[PDB]
Design a protein around this motif. Structure first.
Motif, PDB file in Angstrom:
ATOM      1  N   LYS A   5     -12.065  53.403 -46.302  1.00 54.92           N
ATOM      2  CA  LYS A   5     -12.076  52.523 -47.458  1.00 54.92           C
ATOM      3  C   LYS A   5     -13.131  51.438 -47.260  1.00 54.92           C
ATOM      4  O   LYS A   5     -13.258  50.890 -46.157  1.00 54.92           O
ATOM      5  N   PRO A   6     -13.893  51.099 -48.302  1.00 55.49           N
ATOM      6  CA  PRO A   6     -14.921  50.054 -48.141  1.00 55.49           C
ATOM      7  C   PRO A   6     -14.344  48.731 -47.671  1.00 55.49           C
ATOM      8  O   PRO A   6     -15.014  48.006 -46.922  1.00 55.49           O
ATOM      9  N   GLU A   7     -13.110  48.381 -48.073  1.00 51.53           N
ATOM     10  CA  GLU A   7     -12.561  47.107 -47.619  1.00 51.53           C
ATOM     11  C   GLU A   7     -12.216  47.126 -46.134  1.00 51.53           C
ATOM     12  O   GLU A   7     -12.293  46.083 -45.480  1.00 51.53           O
ATOM     13  N   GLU A   8     -11.828  48.284 -45.579  1.00 53.36           N
ATOM     14  CA  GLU A   8     -11.560  48.341 -44.145  1.00 53.36           C
ATOM     15  C   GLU A   8     -12.855  48.232 -43.349  1.00 53.36           C
ATOM     16  O   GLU A   8     -12.874  47.611 -42.280  1.00 53.36           O
ATOM     17  N   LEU A   9     -13.934  48.855 -43.838  1.00 53.39           N
ATOM     18  CA  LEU A   9     -15.224  48.733 -43.150  1.00 53.39           C
ATOM     19  C   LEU A   9     -15.706  47.298 -43.180  1.00 53.39           C
ATOM     20  O   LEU A   9     -16.183  46.766 -42.170  1.00 53.39           O
ATOM     21  N   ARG A  10     -15.589  46.656 -44.337  1.00 56.29           N
ATOM     22  CA  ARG A  10     -16.019  45.266 -44.465  1.00 56.29           C
ATOM     23  C   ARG A  10     -15.296  44.346 -43.481  1.00 56.29           C
ATOM     24  O   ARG A  10     -15.932  43.594 -42.734  1.00 56.29           O
ATOM     25  N   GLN A  11     -13.962  44.380 -43.468  1.00 52.90           N
ATOM     26  CA  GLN A  11     -13.215  43.460 -42.622  1.00 52.90           C
ATOM     27  C   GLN A  11     -13.459  43.744 -41.137  1.00 52.90           C
ATOM     28  O   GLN A  11     -13.587  42.817 -40.330  1.00 52.90           O
ATOM     29  N   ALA A  12     -13.597  45.025 -40.768  1.00 55.25           N
ATOM     30  CA  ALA A  12     -13.750  45.385 -39.362  1.00 55.25           C
ATOM     31  C   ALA A  12     -15.136  45.042 -38.837  1.00 55.25           C
ATOM     32  O   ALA A  12     -15.283  44.570 -37.699  1.00 55.25           O
ATOM     33  N   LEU A  13     -16.174  45.302 -39.637  1.00 53.34           N
ATOM     34  CA  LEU A  13     -17.536  45.179 -39.134  1.00 53.34           C
ATOM     35  C   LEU A  13     -18.146  43.802 -39.359  1.00 53.34           C
ATOM     36  O   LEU A  13     -19.099  43.435 -38.647  1.00 53.34           O
ATOM     37  N   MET A  14     -17.628  43.020 -40.309  1.00 49.23           N
ATOM     38  CA  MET A  14     -18.219  41.702 -40.532  1.00 49.23           C
ATOM     39  C   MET A  14     -18.263  40.821 -39.295  1.00 49.23           C
ATOM     40  O   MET A  14     -19.261  40.085 -39.124  1.00 49.23           O
ATOM     41  N   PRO A  15     -17.253  40.786 -38.435  1.00 46.19           N
ATOM     42  CA  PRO A  15     -17.401  39.959 -37.239  1.00 46.19           C
ATOM     43  C   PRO A  15     -18.587  40.356 -36.387  1.00 46.19           C
ATOM     44  O   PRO A  15     -19.221  39.487 -35.782  1.00 46.19           O
ATOM     45  N   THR A  16     -18.935  41.643 -36.350  1.00 45.63           N
ATOM     46  CA  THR A  16     -20.076  42.050 -35.531  1.00 45.63           C
ATOM     47  C   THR A  16     -21.384  41.570 -36.140  1.00 45.63           C
ATOM     48  O   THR A  16     -22.314  41.223 -35.404  1.00 45.63           O
ATOM     49  N   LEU A  17     -21.457  41.514 -37.473  1.00 51.39           N
ATOM     50  CA  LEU A  17     -22.641  41.007 -38.149  1.00 51.39           C
ATOM     51  C   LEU A  17     -22.788  39.500 -37.937  1.00 51.39           C
ATOM     52  O   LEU A  17     -23.898  39.009 -37.689  1.00 51.39           O
ATOM     53  N   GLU A  18     -21.669  38.762 -37.958  1.00 48.86           N
ATOM     54  CA  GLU A  18     -21.699  37.327 -37.668  1.00 48.86           C
ATOM     55  C   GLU A  18     -22.232  37.073 -36.257  1.00 48.86           C
ATOM     56  O   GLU A  18     -22.945  36.088 -36.012  1.00 48.86           O
ATOM     57  N   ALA A  19     -21.882  37.950 -35.309  1.00 51.48           N
ATOM     58  CA  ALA A  19     -22.337  37.762 -33.933  1.00 51.48           C
ATOM     59  C   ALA A  19     -23.856  37.801 -33.833  1.00 51.48           C
ATOM     60  O   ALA A  19     -24.437  37.146 -32.948  1.00 51.48           O
ATOM     61  N   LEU A  20     -24.515  38.560 -34.723  1.00 47.34           N
ATOM     62  CA  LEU A  20     -25.971  38.570 -34.739  1.00 47.34           C
ATOM     63  C   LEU A  20     -26.533  37.339 -35.443  1.00 47.34           C
ATOM     64  O   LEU A  20     -27.441  36.673 -34.933  1.00 47.34           O
ATOM     65  N   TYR A  21     -25.985  37.011 -36.611  1.00 45.15           N
ATOM     66  CA  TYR A  21     -26.462  35.857 -37.366  1.00 45.15           C
ATOM     67  C   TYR A  21     -26.388  34.562 -36.560  1.00 45.15           C
ATOM     68  O   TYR A  21     -27.268  33.698 -36.676  1.00 45.15           O
ATOM     69  N   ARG A  22     -25.318  34.381 -35.783  1.00 42.76           N
ATOM     70  CA  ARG A  22     -25.074  33.075 -35.185  1.00 42.76           C
ATOM     71  C   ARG A  22     -26.059  32.759 -34.067  1.00 42.76           C
ATOM     72  O   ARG A  22     -26.130  31.596 -33.631  1.00 42.76           O
ATOM     73  N   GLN A  23     -26.827  33.753 -33.616  1.00 49.80           N
ATOM     74  CA  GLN A  23     -27.872  33.499 -32.624  1.00 49.80           C
ATOM     75  C   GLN A  23     -29.028  32.786 -33.316  1.00 49.80           C
ATOM     76  O   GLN A  23     -29.641  33.326 -34.249  1.00 49.80           O
ATOM     77  N   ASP A  24     -29.340  31.591 -32.864  1.00 51.98           N
ATOM     78  CA  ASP A  24     -30.362  30.805 -33.525  1.00 51.98           C
ATOM     79  C   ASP A  24     -31.156  30.196 -32.373  1.00 51.98           C
ATOM     80  O   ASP A  24     -30.559  29.533 -31.511  1.00 51.98           O
ATOM     81  N   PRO A  25     -32.486  30.445 -32.271  1.00 49.97           N
ATOM     82  CA  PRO A  25     -33.406  30.984 -33.289  1.00 49.97           C
ATOM     83  C   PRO A  25     -33.495  32.486 -33.309  1.00 49.97           C
ATOM     84  O   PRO A  25     -34.240  32.990 -34.107  1.00 49.97           O
ATOM     85  N   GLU A  26     -32.787  33.202 -32.438  1.00 51.33           N
ATOM     86  CA  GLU A  26     -33.077  34.623 -32.250  1.00 51.33           C
ATOM     87  C   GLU A  26     -32.928  35.425 -33.528  1.00 51.33           C
ATOM     88  O   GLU A  26     -33.679  36.378 -33.742  1.00 51.33           O
ATOM     89  N   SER A  27     -31.947  35.090 -34.371  1.00 46.21           N
ATOM     90  CA  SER A  27     -31.758  35.869 -35.586  1.00 46.21           C
ATOM     91  C   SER A  27     -32.710  35.473 -36.700  1.00 46.21           C
ATOM     92  O   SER A  27     -32.773  36.203 -37.680  1.00 46.21           O
ATOM     93  N   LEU A  28     -33.476  34.380 -36.571  1.00 40.70           N
ATOM     94  CA  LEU A  28     -34.210  33.895 -37.747  1.00 40.70           C
ATOM     95  C   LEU A  28     -35.193  34.918 -38.312  1.00 40.70           C
ATOM     96  O   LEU A  28     -35.288  35.014 -39.550  1.00 40.70           O
ATOM     97  N   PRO A  29     -35.938  35.691 -37.505  1.00 41.48           N
ATOM     98  CA  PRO A  29     -36.841  36.700 -38.084  1.00 41.48           C
ATOM     99  C   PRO A  29     -36.141  37.825 -38.796  1.00 41.48           C
ATOM    100  O   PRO A  29     -36.812  38.568 -39.530  1.00 41.48           O
ATOM    101  N   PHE A  30     -34.823  37.991 -38.592  1.00 41.78           N
ATOM    102  CA  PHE A  30     -34.083  39.144 -39.092  1.00 41.78           C
ATOM    103  C   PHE A  30     -33.199  38.843 -40.289  1.00 41.78           C
ATOM    104  O   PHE A  30     -32.556  39.767 -40.809  1.00 41.78           O
ATOM    105  N   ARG A  31     -33.108  37.582 -40.720  1.00 42.08           N
ATOM    106  CA  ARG A  31     -32.160  37.213 -41.767  1.00 42.08           C
ATOM    107  C   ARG A  31     -32.578  37.642 -43.161  1.00 42.08           C
ATOM    108  O   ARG A  31     -31.709  37.713 -44.051  1.00 42.08           O
ATOM    109  N   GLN A  32     -33.868  37.851 -43.394  1.00 39.46           N
ATOM    110  CA  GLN A  32     -34.393  38.232 -44.692  1.00 39.46           C
ATOM    111  C   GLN A  32     -35.403  39.352 -44.497  1.00 39.46           C
ATOM    112  O   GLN A  32     -35.960  39.509 -43.404  1.00 39.46           O
TER     113      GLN A  32
END
Ligand SMILES: CO[C@H]1CC[C@H](n2c([C@@H]3CCCC(=O)N3c3ccc(F)c(F)c3)nc3cc(-c4c(C)noc4C)ccc32)CC1
Ligand SMILES: Cc1cc(N2CCOCC2)cc2[nH]c(-c3c(NC[C@@H](O)c4cccc(Cl)c4)cc[nH]c3=O)nc12
Length: 116
Positions: A5-32
């Protein structure tokens, strides 16, 4: 095949995506998405034929565009592989890519196990 189900994928995988975003400056080239006009790199899309970035991955997860969770894993590695292909090994973007990839490899394993 297991049906996801798309909602199960969203809830399960979003924490892993946050783990990439929260790296700063490392994630800055990848945000857009890479913008070769802005960056002055006219050959970018001659080399990277399938661009991918965090904002595209996030939108796909939020809008249920993944049928199964390994497609999310595929897009994350496509992001990183594009950056390792385009940028020199000594460049800051390449080094930051490798830093994000290490974070991802740590975070993604238990989450994929739990989705099985
Ligand atoms: C709208 O805000 C963005 C922030 C990241 C900026 N940026 C920058 C900025 C501007 C250019 C000079 C520079 O050093 N940048 C930079 C900025 C922060 C970083 F952490 C970093 F490693 C590099 N470099 C980018 C490189 C890439 C890239 C990827 C991913 N794969 O191949 C290439 C080339 C992507 C974005 C880059 C461009 C504007
Ligand atoms: C771990 C790792 C390290 C590195 N290096 C990091 C430091 O900088 C130099 C490069 C490059 C990598 N490329 C890929 C890779 C994929 N991996 C699946 C793996 O995540 C995975 C596999 C089985 C189960 C799970 Cl749950 C997760 C899949 C598709 N295409 C890929 O390229 N994995 C890499």
């Amino acid at each position: 095949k297991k049906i996801f189900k798309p909602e199960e994928l969203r809830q399960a995988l979003m924490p892993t995506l946050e783990a990439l975003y929260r790296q700063d400056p490392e994630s800055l080239p990848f945000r857009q998405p890479v913008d070769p006009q802005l960056l002055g790199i006219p050959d970018y899309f001659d080399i990277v034929k399938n661009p991918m970035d965090l904002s595209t991955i996030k939108r796909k997860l939020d809008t249920g565009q993944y049928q199964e969770p390994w497609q999310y894993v595929d897009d994350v590695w496509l992001m990183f592989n594009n950056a390792w292909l385009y940028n020199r090994k000594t460049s800051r973007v390449y080094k930051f890519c490798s830093k994000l990839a290490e974070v991802f490899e740590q975070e993604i394993d238990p989450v994929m196990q739990s989705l099985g």
